[PDB]
Amino acid sequence: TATYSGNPFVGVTPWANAYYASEVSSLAIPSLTGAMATAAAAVAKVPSFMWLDTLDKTPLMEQTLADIRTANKNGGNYAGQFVVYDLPDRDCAALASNGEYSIADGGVAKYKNYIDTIRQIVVEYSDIRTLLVIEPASLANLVTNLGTPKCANAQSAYLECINYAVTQLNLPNVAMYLDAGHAGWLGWPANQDPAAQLFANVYKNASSPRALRGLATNVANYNGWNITSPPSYTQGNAVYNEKLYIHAIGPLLANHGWSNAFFITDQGRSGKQPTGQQQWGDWCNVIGTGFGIRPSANTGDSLLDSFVWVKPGGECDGTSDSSAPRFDSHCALPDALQPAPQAGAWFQAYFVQLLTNANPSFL
Ligand SMILES: Cc1cc(=O)oc2cc(O[C@@H]3O[C@H](CO)[C@@H](O[C@@H]4O[C@H](CO)[C@@H](O)[C@H](O)[C@H]4O)[C@H](O)[C@H]3O)c(Cl)cc12
Ligand SMILES: *[C@@H]1O[C@H](CO)[C@@H](O)[C@H](O)[C@H]1NC(C)=O
Ligand SMILES: *[C@@H]1O[C@H](CO)[C@@H](O)[C@H](O)[C@H]1NC(C)=O
Ligand SMILES: *[C@H]1O[C@H](CO)[C@@H](O)[C@H](O)[C@@H]1O
Ligand SMILES: *[C@H]1O[C@H](CO)[C@@H](O)[C@H](O)[C@@H]1O
Ligand SMILES: *[C@H]1O[C@H](CO)[C@@H](O)[C@H](O)[C@@H]1O
Ligand SMILES: *[C@H]1O[C@H](CO)[C@@H](O)[C@H](O)[C@@H]1O
Ligand SMILES: *[C@H]1O[C@H](CO)[C@@H](O)[C@H](O)[C@@H]1O
Ligand SMILES: *[C@H]1O[C@H](CO)[C@@H](O)[C@H](O)[C@@H]1O
Ligand SMILES: *[C@H]1O[C@H](CO)[C@@H](O)[C@H](O)[C@@H]1O
Ligand SMILES: *[C@H]1O[C@H](CO)[C@@H](O)[C@H](O)[C@@H]1O
């Protein structure tokens, strides 16, 4: 059944979408040989989230859900996985993933229309359990980056928009996880409570939506889940992995009026620890990374609903071309793989790296 009474990953199987599978099979495999080619075909079967990064990407959500509806007839019990990611003045503390809407030019109204579009799809497919990550980077930027003019000015718009998202997508077949950055961002002891306050306030302000299950961490990042050996670049932070992060912030959510908040954590680029990061804040196309813990609801953890692959490995974080639009200097750092295409575009050398360094291995 589509509705759920607790962990929304229980009794379902996350669906591996055709979009990523097409990228692997048609963009990666023709360039590979032997063992690597075979291993790549296997990656295409690991479920990762589909990002709805533009409004005209919404038909792809429908096509995925149509596939799932079909597969659910043949005994199967599959769930759809999507990222809601189109805020006006998006990615306010970076330049690589700037979006189609701006606050100045009716961006809030356009965002509401975008949410309206997604809501209709979810109603159309009320028979399918649908797992959503809400707006990566946004709320975390509001906690830590009010010193960035673009974020400071986006505050009221972000909170209005996110309130609209979590209220309009509050439906019985839906589970939403608000993006909550990662251990090396919001996990810092001094940021934990302010972050928890903001998250609980979003939840409370939205009348405690039943579909709002908790938080998503490590999205498009690389931190370890439960590594017992803290990496050099984590120096100074007692919260050096994602398990420590969720177990630190969880009780603070409860303290601020959000009880029963649960978590999902991205491990799609977390297989190699330590990573090739020379600094913890180096987020763009990081070298020395591999595909990580496979998506699974068997987490052996009180707070983690599921390990997930949110950022699809192989899809670029940003262009390394200083002369191109949306160039962010982070993408030209020593530990950023180069040359890199536009954010979201296929990045073959990066896919090859992730496959080579995969743990668990595909090879
Ligand atoms: C003490 C210390 C040392 C160091 O080398 O790096 C950091 C980095 C820190 O936080 C970083 O904050 C950034 C926001 O200004 C985050 O960037 C975002 O990263 C996501 C991916 O996780 C990406 O999608 C966004 O576009 C990007 O803006 C970055 O992840 C954090 O590491 C802190 Cl708090 C201390 C550091
Ligand atoms: C509360 O919801 C309203 C809806 O209009 C929104 O404008 C506001 O930003 C929200 N406040 C917080 C603190 O999330
Ligand atoms: C870390 O988590 C993984 C996946 O659940 C598990 O295989 C491993 O035993 C865990 N390690 C520790 C030290 O808890
Ligand atoms: C999900 O929730 C609905 C609404 O209560 C139930 O009818 C269904 O059986 C499932 O548990
Ligand atoms: C309602 O659904 C939850 C999972 O979402 C189960 O854990 C529970 O037993 C009940 O069936
Ligand atoms: C999702 O589908 C898998 C089979 O692919 C099952 O193992 C699971 O029970 C769920 O229906
Ligand atoms: C399958 O889909 C991918 C992503 O849209 C394309 O790159 C590929 O050419 C095929 O259409
Ligand atoms: C793309 O297509 C190939 C077969 O053409 C698969 O092996 C792969 O897993 C992906 O679906
Ligand atoms: C990737 O896309 C090509 C078409 O460009 C297909 O032929 C292939 O099966 C895969 O889906
Ligand atoms: C696959 O990757 C190779 C590099 O090994 C390219 O030459 C080719 O164009 C395709 O992108
Ligand atoms: C990867 O390895 C398998 C093993 O036989 C082959 O079927 C495939 O063609 C590729 O070499």
State the Cα–Cα distance between residues 144 and 186, nearest whole angstrom: 8
The alpha carbon of 156 and the centre of ligand 2 are apart by a number of angstroms equal to 7
| Contact by Cβ (8 Å): 302, 246 | no
> In the chain, how many domains are there?
1
Residue 139, domain CATH: 3.20.20.40
CA of 208 to the centre of ligand 8 (A): 42
Tell me which residue has its CA closest to atom 4 in ligand 3: 299
Count of CB atoms within 10 A of residue 251's CB?
A: 13
Method: X-ray
Closest Cα to residue 175, out of 254, 114, 84, 302? 84
From the alpha carbon of 162, which atom of ligand 2 is closest? 14
Centre of ligand 2 from the C-alpha of residue 275, in Å: 38
Asked whether 3 lines ligand 4 (CB < 6 A), one says yes
Resolution in A: 1.7
Query: Which single residue is written with the structure tokens 């009474």?
Result: 5
The Cα diameter of the chain in Å comes to: 54
Give a three-class secondary structure readout of the chain. Answer: CCCCCCCCCCCCEECCCHHHHHHHHHHHHHHCCHHHHHHHHHHCCCCCCEEECCHHHHHHHHHHHHHHHHHHHCCCCEEEEEEECCCCCCCCCCCCCCCCCCHHHCHHHHHHHHHHHHHHHHHHCCCCCEEEEECCCHHHHHHHCCCCHHHHHHHHHHHHHHHHHHHHCCCCCEEEEEECCCCCCCCCHHHHHHHHHHHHHHHHHCCCCCCEEEEEECCCCCCCCCCCCCCHHHCCCCCCCHHHHHHHHHHHHHHCCCCCCEEEEECCCCCCCCCCCCCCCCCCCECCCCCCCCCECCCCCCCEEEEECCCCCCECCCCCCCCCCCCCHHHHCCCECCCCCCCCCECHHHHHHHHHCCCCCCC
Ligand 8 atom closest to Cα of residue 22: 1
Question: Separation of 109 CA from ligand 2 center, angstroms?
Answer: 15
Q: Which domain holds residue 291?
A: 1-363
Cα→Cα distances 258→141, 215, 330, Å: 20, 11, 35
Q: Which ligand is nearest to the CA of 3?
A: 4
